[PDB]
């Protein structure tokens, strides 16, 4: 399996915008390697990026810069992967958060858990995500919520 | 969910054995009768 000409151009169209430098660098940072894949319409975890990065210090800007000549191979790699998380892997996870299988989960409960488990979110990522559909009760419908996350 | 298809049971016993077999347990640590199942220490608390 390879990368078609449409795949090349999309990677570039973003890469030029990403590499924000007066002088070159014809390179991104291993952190931008993440958000690029996101912007490209891919969805890897930080752990997936750490699965494919030779930087055991994640996260930070200032260690190794990567060219597109290193990015495109990594993209071909991501294109192969299946373990990303489906709707099914989420429909599983939701079925303990409903205190009585309805879809309608409590916003305050959703807050406490996202901050503690999985990857963990920041204060902002919590508050930002819950700005709707919050009704006068506080019932975030976990399924349509997930379908939106799938949608983009 | 993949353990039991459309029509595994039928005999509620026979399709429980299919699902519990898929989850690698024997019908002795937890015992079957007619109506009920009997759980020893941890067994139910391991299903959790």
């Amino acid at each position: 399996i390879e990368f078609t000409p449409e795949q090349i151009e999309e990677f570039k169209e973003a890469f030029m915008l990403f590499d924000r430098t007066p002088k070159c660098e014809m390179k991104i940072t291993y952190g931008q390697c993440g958000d690029v894949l996101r912007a490209l319409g891919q969805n890897p975890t930080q752990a997936e990026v750490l699965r494919v990065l030779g930087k055991p210090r994640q996260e930070e800007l200032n260690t190794k810069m990567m060219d597109f000549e290193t990015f495109l191979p990594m993209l071909q790699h991501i294109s192969k992967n299946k373990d990303t998380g489906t709707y099914e892997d989420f429909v599983e996870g939701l079925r303990v958060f409903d205190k009585e299988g309805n879809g309608t989960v409590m916003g305050a409960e959703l807050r406490h858990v996202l901050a503690t488990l999985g990857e963990r979110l920041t204060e902002d990522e919590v508050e930002k995500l819950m700005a709707g559909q919050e009704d006068s009760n506080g019932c975030i419908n976990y399924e349509a919520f997930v379908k939106h996350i799938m949608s983009s | 969910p993949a353990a039991i298809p459309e029509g595994q049971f039928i005999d509620s016993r026979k399709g429980a054995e299919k699902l519990l077999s898929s989850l690698d347990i024997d019908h002795n640590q937890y015992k079957f009768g007619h109506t009920k199942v009997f759980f020893k220490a941890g067994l139910l608390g391991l299903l959790e």
């Binding site: 009585e100 299988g101 309805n102 | 039928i10 007619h34 109506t35 009920k36």
Partner: protein, 435 residues
């Protein structure tokens, strides 16, 4: 009509005659199918504006009432506390509900008993549970249909005009079989009064309406009355009867119910018809002068039919249920807040599972008094044969029936009674220059 996919999720038997709540067998109806009628009405839901979820949801809750009858308790005589031989029977119930499967299969037989105010436990003896499970499915149905009508009126409320109405009374009953019980009584006790409103309207309210309008009319009447027999106003209906003022005391039986009728109504009140010796060790039958026929009712069983008890816990655990539509069917609010003082219910009033006959007092006042104030339009439909046969008529039956629906006296007044009636301002303005 359901497809092989839905058959899985919905949990129908592939095979037929499995279903235990379907007695006798699979009886047919002359000329209709069962299958294609499904697709028609399901589309009728789409046409109502049901959500794609709720389509399956209402069917989910409705279908379990077939599933429940399968739970086959078996005698294990060491105590007589039977537990039912299976799980599939009650699982096809559970899943459609999304109630805690463990809470179900345990709690049904061993619930937490309110003793005074504290909590004890008990296994129920075989028959106690068997009937108590049968209670559960019929408990869902009474609730679901009451939920259904209220939720269906919702789509059709007069979206902000001047709520002006006609009232059409459609109560399907006055059926004569060997079996008539309390069910037939509560229904036929409205049909009696409707027939009385025919008297009150054909003689009376017709010309009362004329009187108000002030027309060239002459009052005429004949003695066709029922009132000295059948209660009219809510209060008479809400004093009626021994299944009202004594429905809570442990000593009252369906035997004594017939007796206290026999003391208070018999002899002096000529309208009441007494049994032909099923008294003393009785099925307990009685009859009253109902225009269209002397109905044979049976009394035994009215207590439980007016108490309607079930297992607490298992419904209380249904309250903590899922599938939205499954859940809503369970609680209070009912768009109203009031204290519960019992013998019932919620309003009206507090708790004894049921006392529906009292709930049929409240609404009874609200329908009737308003119905007096509304213009009567009537159609007095008569039956040609018992045999359910199209086109056929019998003379002996019709002989009796035309004598019984006050049709004679009914034509004696309604021979001049105007069937056309509009507004005089219009007719005057619309005819003008003819002359």
């Amino acid at each position: 009509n359901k497809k092989p996919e839905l058959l899985d999720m919905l949990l129908i038997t592939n095979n037929p005659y499995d279903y235990a709540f379907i007695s006798q067998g699979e009886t047919t109806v002359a000329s209709i199918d069962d299958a294609e009628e499904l697709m028609a009405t399901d589309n009728a839901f789409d046409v109502l504006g049901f959500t794609s979820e709720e389509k399956n949801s209402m069917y989910k809750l409705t279908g379990a009432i077939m599933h429940f009858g399968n739970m086959k308790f078996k005698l294990k005589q060491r105590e007589e506390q039977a537990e039912p031989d299976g799980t599939e029977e009650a699982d096809k119930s559970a899943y459609l509900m999304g109630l805690n499967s463990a809470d179900l299969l345990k709690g049904l037989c061993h619930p937490r008993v309110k003793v005074g105010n504290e909590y004890v436990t008990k296994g129920q003896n075989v028959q106690q549970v068997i009937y108590a499970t049968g209670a559960l499915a019929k408990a869902v149905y009474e609730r679901m249909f009451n939920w259904m009508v209220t939720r269906i009126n919702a789509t059709l409320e007069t979206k902000q005009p001047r709520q002006y109405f006609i009232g059409v009374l459609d109560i399907a009953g006055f059926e004569i079989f060997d079996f008539n019980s309390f069910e037939q009584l509560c229904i036929n006790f409205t049909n009696e009064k409707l027939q009385q409103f025919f008297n009150h309207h054909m003689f009376v309210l017709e010309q009362e309406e004329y009187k108000k309008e002030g027309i060239e009319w002459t009052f005429i009447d004949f003695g066709m009355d029922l009132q000295a027999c059948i209660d009219l106003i809510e209060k008479p209906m809400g004093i009626m009867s021994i299944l009202e003022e004594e429905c809570m005391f442990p000593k009252a039986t369906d035997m004594t119910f017939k007796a206290k009728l026999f003391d208070n109504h018999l002899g002096k009140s000529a309208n009441f018809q007494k049994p032909r010796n099923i008294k003393g060790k009785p099925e307990a039958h009685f009859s009253l002068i109902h225009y269209a026929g002397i109905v044979d009712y049976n009394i035994i069983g009215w207590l439980q039919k007016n108490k309607d008890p079930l297992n607490e816990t298992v419904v209380g655990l249904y309250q903590k249920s899922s599938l939205k539509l499954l859940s809503t069917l369970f609680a209070n609010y009912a768009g109203a807040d009031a204290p519960i003082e019992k013998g019932k219910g919620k309003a009206k009033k507090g708790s004894s599972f049921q006392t529906v006959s009292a709930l049929h007092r409240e609404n009874l006042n609200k329908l009737m008094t308003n119905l007096r104030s509304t213009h009567p339009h009537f159609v007095r439909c008569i039956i040609p044969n018992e045999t359910k046969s199209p086109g056929v008529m019998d003379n002996p039956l019709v002989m009796h029936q035309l004598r019984c629906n006050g049709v004679l006296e009914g034509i004696r007044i309604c021979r001049k009674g105007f069937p056309n009636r509009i507004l005089y301002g219009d007719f005057r303005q619309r005819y003008r220059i003819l002359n």
